Design brief:
Blueprint: H1 4-11, H2 16-19, E1 40-47, H3 51-57, H4 61-69, E2 73-77, H5 86-90, E3 98-103, E4 114-119, H6 120-125, E5 130-133, E6 152-157, E7 166-172, H7 183-205, E8 215-221, H8 237-240, H9 248-260, E9 263-265, H10 266-270, E10 297-302, E11 309-314, E12 326-331
Parallel strand pairs: 1-2, 7-8
Antiparallel strand pairs: 1-12, 2-4, 3-4, 5-6, 6-7, 8-10, 9-10, 11-12
């Protein structure tokens, strides 16, 4: 089933001591008062693990959060909305000053699903934002039915269409499943399709228009913990690499994507050795209170946009999901 390279990395031992050696506690480089709304964009991403479930436990979850944070675009994943319920969907989680586009999973009910909010002032109008679903570029407001699992929702942003282009891809990457059962799917179908799309987006933003305020931001729950310290240590390193998200092929494929598309895990560019910082905590254990979890949520940015990023940090006090949101600020002229 598994290549020689993968097998080698699976057998090699690493103690907690020897991977958490160079790791330093996470201290956020900014305070909220550094945020300048006139020269910065705020993006956040959040796996809600059931949008209805979340809003049923607290009707104001999205109202209070948007109010407190005023993000320019908010990317949600695991909405678990059903595809035939357009009207029920379009009236669920509505918030003043915001438009949202839905991309619910068709191939399975109450599963997966993806949604993006755009602030009417800054994003809908100021950035002339248009969306697509699936692995599509725009026509020449939403477009196409997209991928059947609801995993990919893209928002295209420019201060002038037809200057600065950004493609923000809201992504809920396919989990390799409990037995690493769907690992061949993740590695052979999904990841390669994601790689191709990101390249094409980067060429949309770049070779078309033009270090430079052009490229893509790949945001969401990428279902991979890429640093050895991107998840708590338990058992053996071998046994750790048996969990979906930490399998050898998952990690190498993600690294490969960042490499092949010329992009960076922006959090690890700002805090290359920080830990423990997680965005996910398994409810199967009592994970959250004991802070043993995973960093599964990301902003991966085109290299040439890296320098514009002011900060990128988790928001672990925001409850309601087994994921916390992750926030990012980007400078613009």
């Amino acid at each position: 089933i598994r290549t020689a390279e993968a097998l080698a990395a699976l057998n090699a031992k690493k103690s907690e001591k020897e991977i958490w050696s160079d790791v330093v506690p996470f201290v956020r480089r900014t305070t909220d008062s550094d945020f300048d709304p006139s020269r910065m964009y705020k993006f956040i991403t959040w796996n809600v693990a059931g949008l209805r479930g979340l809003l049923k436990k607290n009707a104001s979850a999205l109202r209070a959060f948007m109010e407190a944070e005023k993000p320019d675009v908010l990317c949600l994943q695991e909405t678990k909305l059903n595809v035939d319920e357009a009207d029920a969907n379009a009236t669920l989680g509505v918030v003043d000053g915001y438009s949202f586009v839905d991309h619910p999973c068709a191939f399975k009910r109450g599963y997966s699903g993806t949604r993006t909010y755009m602030k009417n002032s800054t994003t809908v109008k100021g950035l002339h934002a248009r969306c697509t679903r699936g692995f599509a570029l725009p026509s020449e407001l939403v477009e196409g039915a997209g991928d059947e699992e609801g995993r990919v929702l893209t928002t295209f942003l420019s201060p002038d269409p037809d200057s600065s282009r950004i493609a923000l891809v809201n992504t809920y990457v396919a989990n390799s499943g409990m037995g690493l059962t769907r690992l061949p799917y993740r590695v052979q179908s999904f990841d390669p399709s994601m790689r191709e799309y990101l390249h094409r987006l980067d060429t949309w933003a770049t070779e078309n228009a033009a270090s430079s305020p052009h490229g893509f931001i790949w945001a969401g729950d990428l279902n991979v913990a890429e640093r050895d310290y991107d998840r708590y240590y338990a058992g053996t390193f071998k046994s750790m690499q048996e969990c979906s998200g930490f399998a050898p092929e998952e990690r190498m494929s993600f690294r490969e994507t960042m490499q092949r598309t010329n992009s960076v895990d922006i959090f690890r560019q700002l805090y290359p050795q920080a830990g423990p910082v997680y965005s996910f905590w398994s409810q199967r254990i009592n994970g959250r209170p004991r802070n043993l979890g995973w960093r599964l949520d990301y902003f991966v940015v085109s290299s040439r946009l890296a320098s514009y990023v002011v900060d990128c940090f988790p928001m672990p006090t925001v409850m309601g999901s087994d994921h916390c949101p992750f926030q990012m600020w980007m400078r613009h002229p």
